[model samples]
Target: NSNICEVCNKWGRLFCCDTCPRSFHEHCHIPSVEANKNPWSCIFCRIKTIQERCPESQSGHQESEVLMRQMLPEEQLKCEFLLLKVYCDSKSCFFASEPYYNREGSQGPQKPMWLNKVKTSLNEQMYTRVEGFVQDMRLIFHNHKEFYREDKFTRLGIQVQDIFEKNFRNIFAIQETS
Candidate 1:
């Protein structure tokens, strides 16, 4: 064997980062990154340099109306699913199983059924619009999760907290540019 992988401590194709001595197995990198870049930085070195390559909204996607490279529809759900899954996991709701939860007395997804809904709509909608909300969801659920199981309300117990109002300004800018 060449050596055990640095990221997994198991045998695999390890891509040694060009900028740092650290390395990672191909699968160890996040879905958005790849080791095959002509030059690469390991995960440890990527974050410190992240802000230096800040993502600008105007940087756009160029997909032909008819895509040549296709993926399964289920795979398309990952765009929004990962963000929600991360937030739900923190709130103690394991979404992979039956019964995606709603606030008490109200009907929710009844399952992780959003995946089905998303599977049908991936080609029709936008995921980036929710990026800000998804980023803030952990904190929203962290403080507000207690209300999720409260059965007092006739319908749903959860209400948007005033904290959402405070944090929302960061998401939608008021700048009136020409």
Candidate 2:
């Protein structure tokens, strides 16, 4: 009796197996029965065939999967930092001032004492706070000036404060004197 190939739907072939009445063209079947010691199902049924049929291998291994995976986190962080920089550079975000700033006259532009205090705390605690990542902090401050430019001073300060508070609350936490 003629049976259809389960994978390609071709007709007029001998029974593929006793368990299932499926059939396939000898040429269409993977490791044709004539060549292989044991008759097996077609390419569609061979799970190992997919592993051997990787697109990366077929393309002469132009890209390294290891390198791609390794770069994924760095790429994601770069995209996030870029978006954050853009948001901080926006006019509204730039114009916003620290609410703690004094509005009264004759006080040398009425700067926010809290911001200065935070900056001082960050500088003093830098050695302890960034123990493991001191090189990274220096890199960010020096080589990556574009990422922390003057225009982004306020935003950078806020980011530093947030990171410090999240990581070293005991040492960097805001204190109430009044």
Candidate 3:
């Protein structure tokens, strides 16, 4: 048997909102579910309607839409492992050292000297304040697991892009290659 709405508790049929996904009864709906389609707008739709109609909400949506569009493919591509390493190094020498340093008493980390220098150079570029950039990078890294679990590849890519952009803007602007 189909479960009834806990709010109204009417039986025989179940109606769920198309937008909000909440279940309701045919009688509980304002216009009656029989008059409409299987999935129809519910009370939450009314609330969303009011909210969207508000000038502030409309403007907020517009701004967010514009901001979202500003995120380009190139910008998204900026989030690379190398870029992240640079950002992490710049944010905290201690953090950079933790990864690079050989904590184990055995053979220490075996990175090339050039790689060490590159890592050092990467850390020097700070787009935002040093602390803020580091904090943001750390947060991004921390949330990476969650992003992967949720299969949010695009979001994860964007975070990497952010790191790349920050590094490029602050560090790569002056480099003249042969």
Candidate 4:
């Protein structure tokens, strides 16, 4: 059987990414998938274009790589790309909506975090450094874990966090200290 939209897992008209196995419903894709184009590429596959356009000299691979207080254009774009990648998956929607989370009732004093809020913060240039971006992302998963606690949603949070961290490292070119 052919796979469903990787973002919604629903049956309907789907757009298949030419470079990957992922299928996406038009609305479910970040920037929304356009049906007007042939040999369409998903964000993941298209990311290489950024690297080719902005090729830089050997960058540090250490975790301590010093970064400026203000994000560069490339870094900013990568952050957007990272968020888009998160939205590209259906499971991430579990942690994305504010209205949905609020309707669940007052659970605790823990400050809530959502993908849209983070993306908005990113858009507003609230992130002075890449670390701030990483912190907000970790907070989203952490808040979800606290709220769900061993539930399936918490597991979903873990999966989303894993995706975030992996892409975060690759996007920012951060290397582990170990």
Candidate 5:
């Protein structure tokens, strides 16, 4: 495993996954690692095991496993991992926190969104469907571009969004649609 935490990229006491080469700080992981659990697997490895044991439904409509009626445990973990990736990819924490005021003069967008809010929703299990989670994630990028216009922050937002979309597809094994 790498010397640094995969999530925060820092060196500290970390829990190394038994099945994967990834290691995470006790707090950086979704379900904080408090105690030693033998043969502990990271989220990605766990998801892989789930997928292998319970393969996706053969129906063609099952293209997106996450679009199911309800959020499955593995699916939920995927969403959390996606959010964590955005957290790691973002160059600055500017969009990570809630806006203190109404953008100074003009009030912020009707539905304000932030990375922290998305993480909160995931933690509280507030999202009933995977689409809601995906929508909220997209909203953060939209809110950033809309609020900042065509500036450096907007460019950064786009870059992160691109990374998100690519990783989203890879995580869920979603095929690109024309």
Candidate 6:
């Protein structure tokens, strides 16, 4: 039992969250667990994992769970930001990303390569909104050289406004923690 104790070096009925490594004796697991337990994300980890976890089947495909789990939210924020900026700037090229502007969905030539790298970063809602926003852009967005203006960059699209704003707040939240 001593070998299984997470605290006090005395164990009896150990339990743990599936996502966490540590284990604890029944009472030692704060908010505590029953004598019979199921893996749960600890008191702390639970808020985090569930809150930002976007809903829906993510292709039911994950390239590498171990690698993804090891990355912190802030690190993901940086990569997502990078992908967005790089994609928006490359006017000459496109993807399942660009085609969104003119079509209903993708036929697959795919959008900017980096775009795919960061696709998983956006929540399902954000993903849908972004696709729609770019599609709308295909219309009035005729020119960006109007770019020198300060106010023009502020308000963006329909679904985009909520999608980008919420995502931005989340990014800043992760940043503040860091």
lDDT of each: 0.37, 0.33, 0.40, 0.71, 0.75, 0.38
- Between which residue pairs do clashes occur in model 1? none
RMSD, model 5, all Cα superposed?
A: 2.9
Candidate 3 ranges beyond 4 A from true positions: 9-12, 55-178
Ordered list by TM-score, greatest first:
5, 4, 1, 3, 6, 2
Q: For model 2, name the residue pairs that clash.
A: none
Where's the lowest-lDDT run of ten residues in candidate 1? 60-69
Measured against the true structure, the TM-scores of the candidates, in listed sequence, are 0.32, 0.21, 0.26, 0.65, 0.82, 0.24
Tens-digit lDDT string for candidate 5 (17-57): 88889988886776566486787888778667766886762
User: Mind giving the per-residue lDDT tens digits that candidate 2 earns over 1-178?
Assistant: 2366543455765446433355656533423335453554433334224335543322322112212332233222222222222222233232223333223332222223222222233334332323322223223323222333455553654554344333222221223233
lDDT by residue for model 3 over 1-178, one digit each (tens)? Answer: 2366623454556777777756656543433354656556665465456446653533322222322332232222222223333433333232233333333333332332222233343344323233333334444444333334445542544555455445544431223233
Worst 10 residues of 2 by lDDT: 167-176
The alpha-carbon deviation from the true structure for residue 45 of candidate 6, after best TM-score superposition, in angstroms, is 2.9
Residue-level lDDT of model 4, residues 78-167, one tens digit each, is: 777788778767778787877234425436425767888887787788887766776777888887777776567568878999998777
Please write out the lDDT profile of model 1 over residues 41-86, one tens digit for every residue: 6544554354245544223322221122233332233333333223
Model 4 off-target regions past 4 Å? 1-46, 54-60, 64-69, 99-109, 176-178
lDDT of 1: 0.37
lDDT-based ranking, best first?
Answer: 5, 4, 3, 6, 1, 2
Q: In candidate 6, how many clashes are counted?
A: 5
Better of 3 and 4 by TM-score: 4
Instruction: Find the 10 residues in a row with the least total lDDT in model 3.
Output: 71-80
Pairs of residues at least 3 apart in sequence or in different chains that clash in candidate 4: none
Highest-scoring model, TM-score: 5
TM-score of structure candidate 2: 0.21
